[PDB]
Amino acid sequence: AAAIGIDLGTTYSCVGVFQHGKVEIIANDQGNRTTPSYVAFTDTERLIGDAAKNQVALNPQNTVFDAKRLIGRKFGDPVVQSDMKHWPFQVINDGDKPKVQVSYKGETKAFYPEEISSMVLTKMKEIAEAYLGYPVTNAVITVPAYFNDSQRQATKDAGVIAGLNVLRIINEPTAAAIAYGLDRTGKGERNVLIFDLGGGTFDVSILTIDDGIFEVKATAGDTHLGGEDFDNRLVNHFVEEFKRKHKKDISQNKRAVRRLRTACERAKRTLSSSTQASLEIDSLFEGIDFYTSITRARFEELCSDLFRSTLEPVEKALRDAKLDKAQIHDLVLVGGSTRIPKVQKLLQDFFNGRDLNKSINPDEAVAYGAAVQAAILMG
Amino acid sequence: STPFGLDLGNNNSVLAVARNRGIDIVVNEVSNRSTPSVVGFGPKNRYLGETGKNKQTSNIKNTVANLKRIIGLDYHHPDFEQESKHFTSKLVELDDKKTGAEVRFAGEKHVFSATQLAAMFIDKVKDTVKQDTKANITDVCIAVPPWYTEEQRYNIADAARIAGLNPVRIVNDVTAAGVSYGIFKTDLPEGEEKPRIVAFVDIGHSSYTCSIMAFKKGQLKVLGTACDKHFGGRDFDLAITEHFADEFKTKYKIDIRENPKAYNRILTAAEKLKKVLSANTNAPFSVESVMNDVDVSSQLSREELEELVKPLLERVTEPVTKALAQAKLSAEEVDFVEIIGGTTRIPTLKQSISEAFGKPLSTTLNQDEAIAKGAAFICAIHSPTLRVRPFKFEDIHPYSVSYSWDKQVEDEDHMEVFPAGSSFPSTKLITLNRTGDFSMAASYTDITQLPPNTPEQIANWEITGVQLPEGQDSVPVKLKLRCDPSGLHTIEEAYTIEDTKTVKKDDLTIVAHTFGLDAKKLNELIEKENEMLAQDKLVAETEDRKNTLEEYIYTLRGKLEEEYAPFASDAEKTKLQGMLNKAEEWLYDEGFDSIKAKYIAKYEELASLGNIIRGRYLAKEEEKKQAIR
Numbered sequence A: 001a002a003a004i005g006i007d008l009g010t011t012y013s014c015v016g017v018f019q020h021g022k023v024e025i026i027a028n029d030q031g032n033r034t035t036p037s038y039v040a041f042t043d044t045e046r047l048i049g050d051a052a053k054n055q056v057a058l059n060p061q062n063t064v065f066d067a068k069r070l071i072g073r074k075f076g077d078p079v080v081q082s083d084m085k086h087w088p089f090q091v092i093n094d095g096d097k098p099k100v101q102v103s104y105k106g107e108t109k110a111f112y113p114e115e116i117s118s119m120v121l122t123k124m125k126e127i128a129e130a131y132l133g134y135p136v137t138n139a140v141i142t143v144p145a146y147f148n149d150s151q152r153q154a155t156k157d158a159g160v161i162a163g164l165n166v167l168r169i170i171n172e173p174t175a176a177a178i179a180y181g182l183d184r185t186g187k188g189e190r191n192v193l194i195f196d197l198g199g200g201t202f203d204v205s206i207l208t209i210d211d212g213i214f215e216v217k218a219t220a221g222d223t224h225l226g227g228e229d230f231d232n233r234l235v236n237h238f239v240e241e242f243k244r245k246h247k248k249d250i251s252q253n254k255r256a257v258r259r260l261r262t263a264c265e266r267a268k269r270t271l272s273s274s275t276q277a278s279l280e281i282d283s284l285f286e287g288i289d290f291y292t293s294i295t296r297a298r299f300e301e302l303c304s305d306l307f308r309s310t311l312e313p314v315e316k317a318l319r320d321a322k323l324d325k326a327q328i329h330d331l332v333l334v335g336g337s338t339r340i341p342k343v344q345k346l347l348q349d350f351f352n353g354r355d356l357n358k359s360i361n362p363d364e365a366v367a368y369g370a371a372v373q374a375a376i377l378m379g
Numbered sequence B: 001s002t003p004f005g006l007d008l009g010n011n012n013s014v015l016a017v018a019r020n021r022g023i024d025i026v027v028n029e030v031s032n033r034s035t036p037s038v039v040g041f042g043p044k045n046r047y048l049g050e051t052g053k054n055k056q057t058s059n060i061k062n063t064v065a066n067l068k069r070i071i072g073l074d075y076h077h078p079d080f081e082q083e084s085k086h087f088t089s090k091l092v093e094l095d096d097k098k099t100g101a102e103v104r105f106a107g108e109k110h111v112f113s114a115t116q117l118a119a120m121f122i123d124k125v126k127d128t129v130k131q132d133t134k135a136n137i138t139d140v141c142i143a144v145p146p147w148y149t150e151e152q153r154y155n156i157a158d159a160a161r162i163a164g165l166n167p168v169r170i171v172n173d174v175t176a177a178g179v180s181y182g183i184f185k186t187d188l189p190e191g192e193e194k195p196r197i198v199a200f201v202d203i204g205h206s207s208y209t210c211s212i213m214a215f216k217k218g219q220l221k222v223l224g225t226a227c228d229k230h231f232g233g234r235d236f237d238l239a240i241t242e243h244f245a246d247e248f249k250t251k252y253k254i255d256i257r258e259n260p261k262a263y264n265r266i267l268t269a270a271e272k273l274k275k276v277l278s279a280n281t282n283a284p285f286s287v288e289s290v291m292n293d294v295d296v297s298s299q300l301s302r303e304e305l306e307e308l309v310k311p312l313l314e315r316v317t318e319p320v321t322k323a324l325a326q327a328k329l330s331a332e333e334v335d336f337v338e339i340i341g342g343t344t345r346i347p348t349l350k351q352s353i354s355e356a357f358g359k360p361l362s363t364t365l366n367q368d369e370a371i372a373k374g375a376a377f378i379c380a381i382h383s384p385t386l387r388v389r390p391f392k393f394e395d396i397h398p399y400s401v402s403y404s405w406d407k408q409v410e411d412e413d414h415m416e417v418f419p420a421g422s423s424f425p426s427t428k429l430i431t432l433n434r435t436g437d438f439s440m441a442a443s444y445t446d447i448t449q450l451p452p453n454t455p456e457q458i459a460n461w462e463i464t465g466v467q468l469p470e471g472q473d474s475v476p477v478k479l480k481l482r483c484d485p486s487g488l489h490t491i492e493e494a495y496t497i498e499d500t501k502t503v504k505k506d507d508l509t510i511v512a513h514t515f516g517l518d519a520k521k522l523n524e525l526i527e528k529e530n531e532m533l534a535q536d537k538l539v540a541e542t543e544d545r546k547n548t549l550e551e552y553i554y555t556l557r558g559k560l561e562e563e564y565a566p567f568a569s570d571a572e573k574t575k576l577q578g579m580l581n582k583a584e585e586w587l588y589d590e591g592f593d594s595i596k597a598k599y600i601a602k603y604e605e606l607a608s609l610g611n612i613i614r615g616r617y618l619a620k621e622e623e624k625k626q627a628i629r
């Protein structure tokens, strides 16, 4: 029996296993290599993963996500109180422990954050078991570097509820580092910056590694940048084109903007792997076709401040660490937004052309390293 | 040279390579682990793979997909309509009665054959691999459906050649998955031990294959294979789209069948609803402005979906029952059932497969990657330089094949050579008594056992150089008849005997007539592909240089105002700002659509000044570090 590595993510989770000299990331039964950290409750059943996420819009009060933000925290924690304002589900107080409150099978039910997370971990465990063909009982689970003892222990409890022996709780940027073999470089300290941008959330970590021993130097959380704002820049730009070319303003038209926005989200994604993208909206406004294009350079420029702002937590982390940028030996990119060329360019230009550890899928590198570490702890 | 395996799917293709420890999946330019099997055309260049798919919805009449399905396809084939209903582009008859695509490309009407079109895609995907490996790619193993015809295999092999690759083997796809199962599992039966019997079921975008195999350590034999080439994901998408076509006529008073673009939007949305229904029991269907101003908002339950495909599902157990009968097995003799292919994720299919074998389903392979990985392993077997752990496999040869020869002095003029239900590859040795030069041919012994409208004759040869010795009656010719590792029927050797001892006399010359292209035609198509490649590359490079120039303008402008500010005189800065402004305005004018050299020159003018200032900036940077240390 192999041990598995689980990235328990705030929005998505990922499981891998080290087998025949390599890490295999395991696809779920829908074929997806990550699984939403979502749990839905309905009149008849409980849904976990993709099924939970598929029905969220139609059952928003009973679909729980972001339990990671609550796990191991107190109800009176200003973070908990702050976060609540953004969730469509109910969070209650049970002796200063937060519980998510839901309608399940025609009844009101409350769940500890670690109960929701155990259901996600049970799912990842079952994914691993279907792929391996036998029971899985041993796991490394990852947490953020800023997690305190209580948050670490609650995550371990979620593991144990899910039927796992938790070999170790390890830091996410430590996991990303193990993925790239930065702990194989022998004696002598190397300073590693892990840059983890993806899914709104943003974490920069500086680790020091010496003889395979890890120490956290700094953590910087600028953890809301990345979504609507870049889209808004493209919408406003193109609204201005239609204004220019047709002498008409499309701003005060709900359906027309949503249609233009949709095209802008698609174009933005295309611009990560191509240097230009076409937009083609039939009868956009008042029966007029809008066919145009945008270059990657133009888009970067429209969003120049939004991109430049990713360096703020880098500079903050360097200050807390009391390091100069020339003292960072190694760079590791994790999270989906690090695929954006400008993110790579800004970072690389900031650190004067230092190489980037980036060849492992940035959504998978954390589960990757947890799997390597789980195999090491077994043998 | 690194071995390269290609799972060429109707919807998407997977790329695997043999290196380091073993076998890796190659990722494309968008970071995807599969690439859409799409070839599109524009005013300036081709749109291949991910870009083909990106441009698809706005360029439907010049986008060809279903590349696999039109290889070897007679234009007047009785089942042509089952293929063409899935095409959005114009199909036309070629000079050889096969099917091609007619397409607006580079300002002209172009006709391309299915072989040509497949070559364009193989070429793109070959470039993905060498971008990833940084190495030479000269050899491929292509996986194809077991229902591929002898002709189709030759055609896809020639497509590889037009793309500059040596098609080392054309392998049955589910056989390649079986090879990856055999090289990955570590506890297979070993000696006099009973083989492990594993059934494989692949259902993809277009095809349903069941193939049952015997496994021992280091080996597999395929026992039975059956296919439904008209059973896949696309048939589900289409049933959903037709359901909504009817619903929207009543509900919205719109007729998407009269509006190809509207219909295509529903079709695209229908695949996504289908996938939601593998996870959820109910799903909303929402499409905005499917026509001018009309937003549609409906739903579909899993139960409703299942009823929609009821006629198709009537065939659901056939490939299982047929593959078992060929194998001469009852369902209970199967040890494990492995599912692969994206369409096996539909719960009703899973239930039916499980029930047909009376077994739970196993999912111990990566379902998307198994075929590609086995193809890369098989390509490595053929490598003269990459030693690989040995694995032996035999595939099923479902039809009887005979060879015939000029009667001359022989009593018989034909014989069965490769029986129905034997294995391939296989070699048979014959000696014939011969009066002179002679013709030969390979054919199907019983044509009633083949698909409708299959020509009886497979291949034919002329053997020349036959010279009788003094005793001038006849001379024995030894022949080497081969069903090769791709299942292709050849003659590889013919020679005359005895020039006390019976030696060889003359090696004979063989002229082969197969479904494979002549050297002349092949080279003409290789040339066409090189021209289109050079044209695509020139456009991508000039597009790149123009983006790089634009980026440098914004970048150098911003720095001149910040970290470079202390490092330039007034005259240097305003001069550079003037040319930055002029270069930017040029990009809207003459430079909107210019040539590569000019984007490069415009860049070198700016950079030549920019670097003088950057140099001073960097020098003071090192000086601050000199004051440190």
Ligand SMILES: Nc1ncnc2c1ncn2[C@@H]1O[C@H](COP(=O)(O)OP(=O)(O)OP(=O)(O)O)[C@@H](O)[C@H]1O
Pocket: A029, A030, A031, B008, B009, B010, B011, B012, B013, B068, B203, B204, B205, B206, B207, B232, B233, B234, B271, B274, B275, B276, B278, B340, B341, B342, B343, B345, B346
């Ligand atoms: N979760 C899912 N539920 C239902 N169908 C799915 C799911 N995921 C993928 N599919 C379908 O599987 C198909 C792609 O599968 P696959 O990659 O095996 O096909 P392919 O190899 O390109 O096709 P073929 O082998 O027929 O040439 C698509 O039609 C896709 O919609």
Ligand SMILES: [K+]
Pocket: B007, B008, B009, B012, B013, B014, B034
């Ligand atoms: K495929």
Ligand SMILES: [Mg+2]
Pocket: A185, A186, A187, A188, A189, A190, A209, A210, A211
């Ligand atoms: Mg070291």
Ligand SMILES: [Mg+2]
Pocket: B008, B009, B010, B173, B204, B205, B341
């Ligand atoms: Mg397939």
Ligand SMILES: [Mg+2]
Pocket: B380, B381, B382, B383, B384, B385, B386, B387, B388
């Ligand atoms: Mg070899």
